[PDB]
Amino acid sequence: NYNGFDEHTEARIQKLARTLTAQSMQDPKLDPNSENFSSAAWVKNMAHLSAADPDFYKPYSLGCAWKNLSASGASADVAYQSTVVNIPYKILKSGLRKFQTNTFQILKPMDGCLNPGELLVVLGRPGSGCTTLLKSISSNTHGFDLGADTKISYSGYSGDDIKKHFRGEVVYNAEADVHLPHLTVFETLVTVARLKTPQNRIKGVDRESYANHLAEVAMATYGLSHTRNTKVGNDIVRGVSGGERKRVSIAEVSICGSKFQCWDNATRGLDSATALEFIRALKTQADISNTSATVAIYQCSQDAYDLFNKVCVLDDGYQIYYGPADKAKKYFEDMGYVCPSRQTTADFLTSVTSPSERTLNKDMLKKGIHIPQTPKEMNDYWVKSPNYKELMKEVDQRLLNPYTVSYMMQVKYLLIRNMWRLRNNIGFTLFMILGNCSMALILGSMFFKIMKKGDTSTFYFRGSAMFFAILFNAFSSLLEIFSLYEARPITEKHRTYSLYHPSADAFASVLSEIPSKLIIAVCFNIIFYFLVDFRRNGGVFFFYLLINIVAVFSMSHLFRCVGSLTKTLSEAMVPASMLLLALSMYTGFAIPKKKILRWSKWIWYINPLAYLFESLLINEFHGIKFPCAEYVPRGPAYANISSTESVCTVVGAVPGQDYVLGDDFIRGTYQYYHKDKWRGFGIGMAYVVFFFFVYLFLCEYNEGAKQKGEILVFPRSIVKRMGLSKSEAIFHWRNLCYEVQIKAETRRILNNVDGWVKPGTLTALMGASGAGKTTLLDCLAERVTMGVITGDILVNGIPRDKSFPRSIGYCQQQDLHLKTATVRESLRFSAYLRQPAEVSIEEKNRYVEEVIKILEMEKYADAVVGVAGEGLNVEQRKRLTIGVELTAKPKLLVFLDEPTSGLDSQTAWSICQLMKKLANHGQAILCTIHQPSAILMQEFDRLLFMQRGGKTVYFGDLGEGCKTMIDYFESHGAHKCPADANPAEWMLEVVGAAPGSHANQDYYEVWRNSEEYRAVQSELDWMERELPHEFSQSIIYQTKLVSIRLFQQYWRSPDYLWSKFILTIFNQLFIGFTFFKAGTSLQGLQNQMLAVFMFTVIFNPILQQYLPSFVQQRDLYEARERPSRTFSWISFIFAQIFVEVPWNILAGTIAYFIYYYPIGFYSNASAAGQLHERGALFWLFSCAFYVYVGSMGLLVISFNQVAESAANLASLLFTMSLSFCGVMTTPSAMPRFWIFMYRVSPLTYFIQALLAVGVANVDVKCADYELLEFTPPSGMTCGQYMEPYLQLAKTGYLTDENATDTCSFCQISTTNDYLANVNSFYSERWRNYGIFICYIAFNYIAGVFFYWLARVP
Ligand SMILES: Nc1ncnc2c1ncn2[C@@H]1O[C@H](COP(=O)(O)OP(=O)(O)OP(=O)(O)O)[C@@H](O)[C@H]1O
Ligand SMILES: Nc1ncnc2c1ncn2[C@@H]1O[C@H](COP(=O)(O)OP(=O)(O)O)[C@@H](O)[C@H]1O
């Protein structure tokens, strides 16, 4: 626990000061070693030492005064939900409404003043304008605008002053949880203390020693010195606790030296003890550094409220009170509202703004004196108050009278921090290194057997191997965008502190990835270059290595720029995919620079990979003569030949040559000239530098954070215009015990628990964290999977059946609903699937309307659930949860887990009122309650109080004012309950884990031996004597409803569908028009092969775009719908399949139309008289490919938990399939080992069939440079000369069969002969289609099976 600078921390800070000064030496009030030390002065000295630099004019302390502070913002309309059809018009409308609005008064004029060293607390129900006030007084006024009369002064400096010259002294923190998960607390603080060492003025101690001491004192002051070596952690990363993480925020801003602070959601997710610790850390900072700190908080504890100097109270943007915290209660008591004895003053002030919870004074209503009731009247009363006169007499008097370290040091310290991140999360780094190296080994091994010979038969494979080398080197670095997005929030926070240039963070993040890039570019390249057997000269190898290093750095900087412009990785996967396709496909291998069309030659000219690949090919081919592999006149009749009467079958060949010069081959095929060897390096370095600087400039400026109104979405159709079933049976349990085996061998978590719930009764379940409240609720609701349960649960004395889970409603604490569904649609979905099938749908609709009316939500009964930020809010989301569990007509009970937790006192009271209403309608509610107020506690009928380990201490009716419980506890030697004490806190103090957690005795024993225990046992015996289809709907009906809901999710998911379709359109149109009418020359056929190959590379983006949808539906299902027995996993998976399939078919049809015809396959079909059949088969293959991408996404996401891991696995499998497809290396040249991968990969059959359907059954038309030129023997024309050869090699043709001087010879006479080399046959098209369909079926079946394995209990 943290007690706010208590003597412990004074001693520990003296220890730290002794350490520092002894190290350095290697007035007595400030001397660590001599007696009479004062740690408070010591730390305070440091505050001066960093603030009072004679060269930095930062103020010692900033107050704040503000009068007439009005804040207004653009009115909040109802934004109709975006669907996949209406979003284009929405976009156009938004564009016209942004180029060519009425306002809402967020905050009515306010006054106030916060002096240095004071704590201000802002109270008010959500929506009252607390966040806007904090942003206004801290000058973070973006998304709204202040009035012309607003006068705000920071002890002389205007808002326009701190906004420029002192920004970072005035800080607003919407959250105190944003941190870097993998840095330890000490690392997180020492990096900041290094960036904030006034190092030009400290003498006698190394800058690092002083930074260490400063971070150590910051941990000591704020109670974190135990977490020195613990990872700061996160929600998903275990580490320090939430309270300790918020105190790390406090210590970090303390080191940063801010003077005016605002904490908006300070104690979100914190129980009273931890929230009080946080407020105590703020108080410690206030009196150690003189920092005025404002906070907005909910359910402020009285012990936490006492710490606050001043209170501001808001109501609908009106200021009802501003003054000392200890006078607010009395001020509102004079106004005419009476505080119930057991109400904390924070709760009293916040409830005075709640028409249904205020207790107006009757005495002043006897004499008929006016009491303001509406917020306008309360403000009109305050402005007339005498307290307002005092406050203004102070505010008037108050108004009438960049970085500590250089840029290089900032870069150095942030680089050290980045390395700390790397070695604290090394696993990802090792994954990158080893995955790249192993892909190197595999893919290079694929090239092992063919490069040994070194003949001219290896030229295409040399091209393709160099293509692989450059692509892999270029795109290896792309995993660091994850770290970029992970660090952006922290960079923004540290920017709002005048802590460092964001350019410094960008530059340091670039530098921290160099070691990984070099390790990869060494290991991968050594393995690949050795195995692929490129030129063995050391010089050429090192030139290759340098080119690859330049490639990786250029692409890393380009995609850092691309990621910088985007907000989330999902928003970047589309443009990044477009750039990836362009760069990869115009690199010079998929389409030689000769073959590129006039419309897209500029792409090749601006592609750094193009020049780098040119340099690589020049390096690999230049100057080495390759012996010939086969000459075109061949066989028996062609043994006696003169040199000039036979060529090599390769582009650069010359008749009579024993070899081909690689230079000629590249000049002819690619048009690369040795004079361009070093141009590629120069241009690559130019782009490296330019995009590095663009990345810095983008990270420096293009950032922002804007405010937004709480907007309901209300689907467009709406926007155009705009009883209960009694719980029937008693439920009870007896001698219930529970055990697990995970954290220990037979670790008990519920121990001899017993009790009951009856119709029309509200029973609270209480106990400190742990104590198995949620565990007991899960055990009773038959909701647990692990552990074993003994003791008997019963309904009317009979064991609970196997249909029991459908008779109980269980409202989970962390409610989760389909974010696209509306409230009414969600309720009706719940009713349609859970209520009995014999009930008509009209009756279910009527009941849903009745439930909507009961819970008071017809004002938002057609609102979209949305997210926590937009759509519904916490209160309305909890109301929807309760309604969803109610609309299933639970026969027996409604279990509620912590329905109030996380809310403010007024909405928690509204929830408790709803629960009491339901218990009055006839329901039987057993709700778990966490740290309730006395007013909330009063509403409950019965109480079941447990100790840690689920040891029941008191079961019974608590009675009025909790008097029965108080009497039971007092009558057994408990210390009495003070008349102002909350009874729940009192009983957790009597026995529990509350601060002061010592119990004079163990009260489980007292219960066991009590009178009430025997009363409970007698009643439970009498109930035992009183006793005298796993789903509600058929699997088909469940699948119908679930698939309908998923279709309504895809529709209304415009981002997913439109990213899918525009990615398909761009990628496929770009492939089609890059190879626009590629023709039927020998290079044309190869270009069409590589085009059909590029068609597949849309695999990964489509799968990754898809996976989040399944993950969302899966989270909803597993969390809520599975335990509720709403529908079976069969229905869930079949919906995930049926919905995905049609959209993928549509995408495949679009791709077919924009790919088949532009590339020219249709003319190839027509010339063969096979137009319609080949077109239909090509369209079938396109649709099958997209359906296959969907099915493989399902297969990988079925058993994987996170989407990213499933995407990585799918990418690995697709890489294997594509690499061994037989296109980058023919199976003949493949090593004997890898043929299995060439047989099992679906893309072999897909691409073989698709290229056969594209180019087969037409005549080859060799281009001028492709034709072989030689001369015939004496006296015979080339027809006679070549006739014997054509007799055997039944393919090839002569341009002039009768020519006698020199003849041009094309190897292949028909595209079928070329395809046979690729092993693609037009006779196997339908067989290959069948094989691909079987692949799709296997994917879906295996995905269903793996979901049943890894996920279904
Ligand atoms: N442009 C705008 N900016 C901010 N709020 C706006 C705007 N337009 C309307 N509002 C509304 O004004 C009210 C101001 O409340 P504000 O969000 O400032 O405090 P709060 O919501 O009580 O605090 P918290 O965000 O901590 O819950 C909100 O209900 C919001 O929906
Ligand atoms: N991984 C686990 N395996 C087995 N039991 C667990 C595990 N995690 C938590 N528990 C048990 O479940 C309890 C958490 O739920 P519970 O305590 O009922 O919620 P609350 O703390 O709100 O009452 C813990 O006290 C612990 O005894």
Curated annotation (Swiss-Prot):
UniProt-recorded Gene Ontology molecular function terms: ABC-type xenobiotic transporter activity; ATP binding; ATP hydrolysis activity; identical protein binding
Keyword Mitochondrion on entry: no
CDD domains to which the protein is assigned, alphabetical: ABCG_PDR_domain1, ABCG_PDR_domain2
Residue numbers on the Cytoplasmic membrane side: 1-423, 486-517, 557-571, 700-1088, 1165-1175, 1231-1239
pH dependence: Optimum pH is 7.0.
Triggers of expression: Expressed during exponential growth. Transcription is transiently activated within 40 minutes after induction by benomyl and other toxic chemicals. Multidrug resistance and PDR5 mRNA level are activated by the transcription regulators PDR1, PDR3, YAP1, YAP2, STB5 and by the mitochondrial rho zero mutation. Mutations or deletion in the PDR1 or PDR3 transcription factors strongly activate PDR5 mRNA and PDR5 translation. The transcription regulator RDR1 represses PDR5 expression.
Family annotation (SUPFAM superfamilies): P-loop containing nucleoside triphosphate hydrolases
Segments in the Extracellular topological domain: 449-464, 535-537, 592-680, 1112-1142, 1201-1205, 1259-1327
Effect of residue 1244 to I: Alters drug specificity
Residues modified to Phosphoserine: 24
Outcome following mutation: residue 233 to D: Confers generalized drug resistance
Effect of substituting residue 770 to S: Inactivates drug transport
Regulation: FK506, isonitrile, enniatin, RU49953, kitasatospora E420, staurosporine CGP42700, prenyl-flavonoids, D-octapeptides were found to be inhibitors in vivo. Vanadate and oligomycin were found to be inhibitors in vitro.
Domain notes from UniProt: The N-terminal ABC transporter domain (positions 161 to 410) contains degenerated Walker A and B ATP-binding motifs, suggesting that it may be less efficient in ATP binding or not functional at all. This is a distinctive feature of the PDR subfamily.
Family listed: Belongs to the ABC transporter superfamily. ABCG family. PDR (TC 3.A.1.205) subfamily.
Name of protein: Pleiotropic ABC efflux transporter of multiple drugs
Species annotation: Saccharomyces cerevisiae (strain ATCC 204508 / S288c)
Lineage: Eukaryota, Fungi, Dikarya, Ascomycota, Saccharomycotina
Gene behind this protein: PDR5
